[PDB]
Each structure stands twice: as C-alpha cells, then as structure tokens.
Amino acid sequence: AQWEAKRGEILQYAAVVAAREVREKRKKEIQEAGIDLASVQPEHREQMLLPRSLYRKETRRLFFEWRRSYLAPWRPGGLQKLMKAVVTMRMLQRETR
C-alpha cells in the first residue's frame, strides 16, 4: 500500500536517475564508436544522448529493481525462514522442559 501510494514520485525519481545514467552510458558508447558530437545537430545530439527507448527501459528497470528490493522479504523463501525460526525456538524451549 505504501509503494502504491508513493508510486508516482518513485517513478519520477527513477526517470531522473535513468536519464543521467543513460546519458553517461550513451556518451561512452558514442566515444568508443568514434563519432564526434561536434558534427551532430543539437536536436539530433539530444536524442542520441538520451534515446527514448533506452531512457524508458532504464527508468522501468530501476523502478522494478526498487520494488523487488522493497518486497523481497516475502519471496518464496522468507516465510519458510520465519516459520522455521519460530518452530525451532519453541522446540528448544519444550526440549529443555
């Protein structure tokens, strides 16, 4: 419920971080490819440095990584861990008794 309530702001911040990261990565890739950005038009340069596909993909990727990290404790192992710990403690008590 908390994640759903704050969904919009989380996605906006994810978009900001993804924009920065994609700009850095695309600058590196263009440098490696050997294209000089001084010859590309500024309107072309902006799109090349922040392609829509990469920007949106990275935004969604970061959003869902944050979601999975937030909700990890309830993956198919956590309930088993918790119940095992509780049962072990109570069994230790009864064994001593």
Partner: protein, 240 residues
C-alpha cells in the same frame, strides 16, 4: 483419413465465398479465428503511450473480462437471494397440513438430514425472519436457559442460481422506408458456427504445419500489405 479432401470444401466458420464475400475461394480457413467467438478475458494495450513516464496507463481491461472473471457475494446478489428465498419458502411457510407434510416439503425444497449440509431453516433451533413474531419452540415446556437460536445458512442451489444469473444477463428518425427488406430476418450457418463450437469441423492437419503456417503468415502478411500500399502510393505520386 489421408490425403487432400476430395469433394466440397467449405469454410469452417460458415461464411460464404465469392467475389465480394469474406472468403475469395473455397477452403476450411481454420486459422482465421476472427470468424469465431473468442472472448477477451485479458487486458489490452495501445501502440503508443503519450505520457512521459511508463506508468502502464495504456493497459486497460477488456469488456468481456468483467464476465470472464466475475465476483460473487455482491449486494445485489444478496438482495436477489433474499427475495428469491422468501418466494421459494412460500410453500413450506403457508403449508397448514401437519408437521410431517411440512418436513416433507422442506426436505424437497432443500434436502438435508444426517450426514448432510442443509440450511437448517425448519429446525426448531434456528432463527427465521417471520412477519408475525412467535415463540421459537405451551408455557410449561420451554428452554429455561438463554440458548439463542443459531443463524440459518443459505440454500446452496438457489444461491448458485442467483450468482450464475449474471452470466445470462444481457445488456425522431429520418423517415426513409426500406422496401428491399426481409420480413423475418435470416438465419445463416455462420451465426451458429460462430459461437457453438461443437458443430465445427475438427482438423486433420498436423499441428506442426499449423504452427508453420502461423510463422509464414507473421512474415508474409506485412509484405502483401506493403505491396498494395506501394501500388497506391506510386499511383498517387504519378498523378501528382
């Protein structure tokens, strides 16, 4: 059977073939599922998302999904069940022959007994919504303790009927008179074969070749589309 079909080949959908018909030539056309009833029980998205953030705003439920994935126990279900329970209990309620016949009618209406799960409506220890309140069941015999009457559980058959009724629920002028009209409409074969699946033909084709046909279509249909569109665009350019 083996080999190609020898004889008359008709579309399995029931649609006619002709120059201005859905099919140009004879054939079975079992891959054409747009001519049969396939409910949309999932969601639908759009080609483009105008919003600047991928929020999944284009995704939306399909209209048939509300009938595919229903929810039971809704207030209108409860109200319908209440009215229908009153009407359905009318007979046992107004029976005035004797306890034996009353129990017989009650069992006929809602079977129950040892080893069975009933509504307990006729039980002396269950509360009912009587119009004229009376003794639960003269002064000599009663229950000296409190012992409130237990609630009555629903009639499963009637409740299921009420819940399933939803699947069967169905949702001046320009004075131009039609003279080339039909008095009693018409009932083609397609109207039946569209939704009554058991009347259609079962394929003798290999699923391998069915899948191969799908794979061929996925690569060839766009080329034909572009062929005709290119014809039209070249003609327009020449005219220009």
């Amino acid at each position: 059977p083996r080999g190609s079909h020898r004889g008359g080949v008709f579309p399995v959908s029931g649609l006619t073939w002709g120059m201005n018909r859905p099919y140009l030539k004879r054939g079975l056309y079992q891959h054409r599922r747009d001519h049969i009833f396939t409910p949309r029980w999932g969601t639908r998205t759009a080609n483009f998302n105008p919003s600047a953030l991928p929020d999944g705003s284009t995704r939306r439920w399909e209209n048939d999904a509300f009938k595919a994935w229903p929810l039971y126990g809704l207030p209108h279900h409860v109200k319908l069940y209440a009215v229908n329970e009153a009407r359905y209990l009318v007979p046992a309620a107004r029976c005035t022959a004797g306890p034996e016949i009353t129990q017989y009618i009650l069992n006929q209406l809602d079977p129950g007994g040892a080893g069975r799960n009933c509504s307990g409506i006729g039980r002396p220890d269950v509360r009912l919504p009587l119009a004229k309140p009376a003794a639960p069941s003269s002064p000599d015999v009663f229950d000296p303790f409190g012992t409130p009457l237990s609630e009555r559980s629903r009639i499963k058959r009637l409740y299921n009927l009420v819940c399933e009724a939803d699947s069967w629920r169905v949702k001046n002028a320009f004075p131009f008179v039609d003279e080339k009209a039909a008095l009693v409409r018409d009932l083609p074969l397609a109207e039946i074969l569209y939704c009554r699946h058991t009347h259609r033909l079962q394929s003798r084709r290999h699923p391998f070749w069915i899948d191969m046909g799908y794979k061929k279509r996925i690569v060839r249909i766009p080329y034909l589309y572009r062929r005709r569109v290119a014809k039209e665009e070249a003609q327009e350019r020449e005219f220009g």
